Design an enzyme around this catalytic site. Structure first.
Site, short mmCIF file in Angstrom:
data_model
loop_
_atom_site.label_atom_id
_atom_site.label_comp_id
_atom_site.label_asym_id
_atom_site.label_seq_id
_atom_site.Cartn_x
_atom_site.Cartn_y
_atom_site.Cartn_z
N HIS A 1 25.14 4.33 14.73
CA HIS A 1 24.84 3.81 16.05
C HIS A 1 26.18 3.19 16.78
O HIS A 1 26.92 2.55 15.84
CB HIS A 1 23.81 2.57 15.87
CG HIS A 1 23.54 1.85 17.23
ND1 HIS A 1 24.28 1.18 17.85
CD2 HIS A 1 22.02 1.87 17.54
CE1 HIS A 1 23.59 0.62 18.92
NE2 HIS A 1 22.13 1.25 18.97
N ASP B 1 24.82 -1.21 8.28
CA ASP B 1 24.05 -1.29 9.54
C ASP B 1 22.47 -1.41 9.11
O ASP B 1 22.06 -0.28 8.74
CB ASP B 1 24.43 -0.66 10.78
CG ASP B 1 23.39 -0.36 11.97
OD1 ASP B 1 22.35 -1.20 11.90
OD2 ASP B 1 24.05 0.18 12.96
N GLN C 1 17.72 -0.73 11.66
CA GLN C 1 16.30 0.08 11.40
C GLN C 1 15.98 -0.05 10.00
O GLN C 1 14.70 -0.20 9.63
CB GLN C 1 16.33 1.56 11.52
CG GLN C 1 16.75 2.15 13.02
CD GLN C 1 15.62 1.85 13.79
OE1 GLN C 1 14.24 1.97 13.48
NE2 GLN C 1 16.13 1.44 15.24
N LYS D 1 13.54 -5.81 16.76
CA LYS D 1 13.18 -4.56 15.91
C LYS D 1 12.12 -4.82 15.02
O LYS D 1 11.27 -4.42 14.74
CB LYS D 1 14.07 -3.64 15.74
CG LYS D 1 15.02 -3.24 16.83
CD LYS D 1 16.23 -2.18 16.31
CE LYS D 1 16.56 -1.51 17.79
NZ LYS D 1 17.52 -0.96 17.51
N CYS E 1 22.08 5.76 21.88
CA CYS E 1 23.51 5.23 21.38
C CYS E 1 23.94 5.66 20.09
O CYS E 1 24.39 5.05 19.19
CB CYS E 1 23.04 3.67 21.15
SG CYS E 1 22.90 2.49 22.49
C1 PLP Z 1 19.32 -0.96 17.81
C2 PLP Z 1 20.29 -0.73 16.65
C3 PLP Z 1 21.47 -1.37 16.58
C4 PLP Z 1 21.87 -2.41 17.71
O1 PLP Z 1 20.97 -3.78 17.70
P1 PLP Z 1 21.19 -4.65 18.89
O2 PLP Z 1 20.02 -5.55 18.61
O3 PLP Z 1 21.15 -4.15 19.97
O4 PLP Z 1 22.23 -5.44 18.63
C5 PLP Z 1 22.34 -1.20 15.45
N1 PLP Z 1 22.00 -0.08 14.80
C6 PLP Z 1 21.17 0.76 14.63
C7 PLP Z 1 20.81 1.73 13.68
C8 PLP Z 1 19.88 0.30 15.84
O5 PLP Z 1 18.77 0.83 15.70
#
Ligand code: PLP
Ligand code: PLP
Lengths: 392, 145, 398, 137
Positions: free
Chosen positions: A111, A188, A191, A214, A350
């Protein structure tokens, strides 16, 4: 034993929402979160609701520690989301350490939150971003890392799970290769924390990031988990109240982590509400809820694959289903589907380099959660057939 | 009198043309179907031509809008959209504003032709980010002249 | 005319007993903010609504109007000069890092008032250390205000930035901001105005005052936590480097580099605190129906009733300036922490300690203060309660 | 040197505190109590673990050959000063084992002092308690 109807019942938005298939952008919230928030902003000025909110707040880092199997609550740092968490690691850990010519390895599945901070710190320090491409199953090619890693490799940035393909790379191996070269790893988990929350001790993760909104939770709140020695090594992030110990016109000293990293008034509402999300969620077996969401995604993917021109980008029978239809623009489909009563997402998610790799400029994405049902799949398939008739 | 990125809207396709097409349509689905058809008369704009228009970006769909003043002292507008629905909405908009002066464009209420054709309240695409940005860019452009 | 009972009735937190006198730390919330938040978290944010049609529209309308409502509070010339942040603290760090840091040379000077909250001092110490520049103290005049008339003495060809609080969180005092700005602009300097308290009590007309940057927090303005504003002149927001990197702030990205949106979006990476923007919008819309000049006169009138009575108790000392609605004080030979605890037991919520203003309290000659801060939901009854609770605490700490 | 655990004991405190049922009397009596904690001079505040919270507090220790622990400390605030006196009465002369064995805050429960202890959690007592745990390790 997981009961979908029991999980589903806790979500007040569901009657108005119709068919909600965009949890991967943001999740609906359970009553516990709505009610903890209502209570916090309503709280009698100047004792039983008061104490319950106090325990939610003071226990909040520990509830995050339990999700991730962190060794202790002081490895949990509050941020405004995965985005700030990654920028903090880039700026506070990486930037003071990187030298011209050092290399940062970044997967093409990342992302933008786990890619742009790395471009930026690269430009500031003269380090270089080096691409980790996908293998034939559309996962970051962890097997290639030994070949990509050099004596200049300092950082590996890798998504636990893609918000496009739902695919998870072999993170245990990746981290073992990176650590063998003396690299630190930014995972990251935005998800992954929702679907397969990471055991940060077992995986030996250096830094892990996720967002509340999320994980069935408030907006404006996220987590940075780091090993205590790395949090201690990090430079301070924003300056101001709370992070500081002593201050004068000659300079300042700071708290240690995590407070060192948290200037100013916390997002108290967001902490309390993410605490309530986590406490509520802990009554469910996450493996069982995730198998349910995945089984619906499969039912949808098999039905849609019967329609002409369908292609799926879905990995590992994910609960996320990214897809497109030959000769139909994703914008037109997302619009008609919304008119039909189905909420999903279209566009680049993104992840412009991943989409460029896959050879497309956008896709539709329907993502399933444990409050989705078999009828939600029937409704989506019904709306797609009606939309395709209008568009082809 | 040929123009950059020529299109038929406001010249050979008129508000009158559109009223005839759209006035009989009462079902929302048929309105989208006819928007899709109408947008087929907007020529595709090659990559090289897009870079002389303003990208009016959005998440789902790229739209371009650019403008100039013609030899007759009237504004000429041109553009493209990837999505076919928004391409039809763009054609409606081009029909409303093509060959107007800055002054006439400041006199006109935003999106009035869309209410006339039964498109604005009835279709959510009409009230979306893409079309509201387009509307704003016309205003901006009319001011800038 | 302003009706205090009308204003007070909109706060669910005040329905049952408690005397709340810590609004300068954080404000209570009106029903409109509570209900907007409840609605936002109880409805899908997607594009499908099957039962709560009008309630979804209103959430979208609050969100879309939010920048404009902040522009209206500050008389900013347009809503693209409003940037969302986590709070005043993030707002000030962004200006230090994205405006000042690329422009500061070694030996350059940043004048910071001694009355600054840590939010408006620490980021300047940090950026000074990063660029070889220097933080220079702007001392207090006789009235305990930043000595704006000393500026011509402190300003040199190396002076670049003035960091000055519109209103202190300890004294309630407001320096002569218009005059400080005129001196700073004569020398080509830029001014960071910390409006975390001023935005509540005397919201700044950023055009009339020619303010370069202005920062405040939602939670002190009767709104959500986790949300704040940075106002900057459009030219300065345009000059700024991007702040955090990620989605929304980018335009195109590849492994070769990235381009960004223009401001404000350039400076707002990732998912916004959408609940915070909506709740703040609802706070501002709600507050717009009140005349702030009158509501503030009300709050200051109460602080004056309290200070007058308290000054009849032996050993009383007030740090209050300009008859502010903020009343910071102490009692000779009584520790502020003993007093706040006992007052809390008596049902008065006040604040004690350093108030994130260590340099100020050192200039004042103290280690901490009690602080009672009044707001338009407070009453005369609140004043009698505070004074009585102080009396009982004093009998215990005798 | 302080009376707590020697001249002032759990029993002497019980005679003072157990009979109290009014919260104001409890505070009155806490404040009385701390008068009897000597003022830690600068020289050995240096030899203690300093804590800045609203209130400033100090906590130092020595360990006898035996492993009997002598604790010292101080508080700016008089109510925390009082609570510190109770705490010192619970822990003075205890070994690391006896310290890990007991619940250190039984004494507060015993004297009917939990609400006062509760009210001053944030400014010294949490931290004092944690430096008790850390000294035993
Ligand atoms: C949404 C998402 C992000 C970004 O999170 P934010 O809450 O906008 O800062 C980063 N990595 C992944 C894989 C995402 O789905
Ligand atoms: C509260 C306050 C701040 C800090 O605001 P946060 O919301 O914590 O970032 C800055 N300056 C003053 C004057 C304040 O009162």
């Amino acid at each position: 034993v997981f009961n979908p109807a029991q999980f589903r019942a806790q979500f007040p938005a569901l009657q108005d929402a119709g068919v909600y298939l965009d949890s991967a952008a943001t999740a609906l919230k359970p009553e516990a979160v709505v009610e903890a928030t209502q209570q916090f902003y309503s709280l009698s000025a100047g004792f039983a609701e008061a104490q319950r909110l106090t325990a939610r707040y003071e226990a909040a880092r520990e509830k995050v520690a339990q999700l991730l199997n962190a060794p202790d609550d002081k490895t949990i740092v509050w941020t405004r989301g995965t985005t700030e968490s990654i920028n903090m690691v880039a700026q506070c850990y990486a930037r003071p350490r990187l030298q011209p010519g050092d290399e940062i390895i970044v997967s093409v599945a990342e992302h933008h939150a786990n890619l742009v901070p790395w471009l930026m710190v690269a430009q500031q320090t003269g380090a270089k971003v080096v691409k980790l491409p996908l293998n034939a199953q559309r996962l970051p090619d962890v097997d290639l890392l030994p070949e990509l890693i050099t004596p200049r490799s300092r950082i590996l940035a890798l998504g636990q799970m893609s918000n496009v393909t739902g695919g998870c790379p072999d993170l245990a191996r990746a981290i073992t290769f990176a650590h063998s070269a003396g690299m630190v790893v930014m995972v990251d988990g935005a998800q992954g924390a929702v679907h397969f929350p990471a055991d940060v001790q077992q995986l030996d993760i250096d830094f892990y990031a996720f967002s509340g909104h999320k994980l069935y939770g408030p907006t404006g709140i996220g987590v940075l988990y780091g090993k205590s020695e790395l949090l201690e090594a990090m430079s301070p992030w924003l300056g101001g109240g709370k992070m500081v110990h002593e201050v004068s016109f000659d300079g300042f000293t700071t708290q240690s982590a995590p407070w060192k990293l948290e200037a100013g008034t916390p997002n108290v509402a967001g902490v309390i509400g993410l605490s309530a999300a986590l406490e509520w969620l802990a009554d469910y077996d996450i493996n069982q809820a995730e198998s349910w969401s995945r089984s619906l995604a499969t039912l949808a993917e098999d039905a849609l694959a019967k329609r002409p021109g369908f292609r799926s980008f879905r990995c590992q029978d994910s609960s996320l289903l990214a897809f497109d239809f030959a000769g139909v623009h994703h914008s037109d489909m997302v619009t008609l589907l919304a008119e039909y009563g189905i909420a999903l997402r279209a566009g680049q998610h993104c992840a412009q380099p991943l989409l460029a790799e896959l050879g497309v400029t956008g896709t539709l994405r329907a993502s399933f959660a444990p409050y989705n049902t078999k009828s939600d799949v029937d409704a989506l398939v019904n709306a797609v057939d009606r939309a395709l008739e209008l568009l082809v | 009198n040929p123009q950059f990125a020529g299109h038929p809207f406001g010249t050979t396709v008129t508000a009158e043309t559109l009223r005839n097409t759209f006035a009989p349509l009462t079902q929302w689905e048929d309105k989208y179907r006819q928007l899709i058809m109408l947008g087929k008369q907007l020529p595709a704009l090659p990559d090289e031509l897009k870079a002389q228009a303003k990208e009016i970006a959005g998440c789902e769909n790229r739209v371009w809008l650019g403008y100039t003043v013609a030899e007759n002292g009237k504004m000429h507008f041109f553009g493209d959209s990837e999505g076919r629905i928004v391409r039809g909405l763009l054609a409606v908009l081009l029909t409303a504003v093509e060959g107007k002066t800055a002054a006439e464009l400041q006199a006109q209420s935003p999106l009035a032709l869309f209410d006339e054709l039964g498109l604005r309240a009835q279709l959510s695409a009409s009230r979306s980010q893409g079309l509201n940005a387009l509307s704003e860019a016309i205003i901006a452009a009319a001011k800038q002249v």
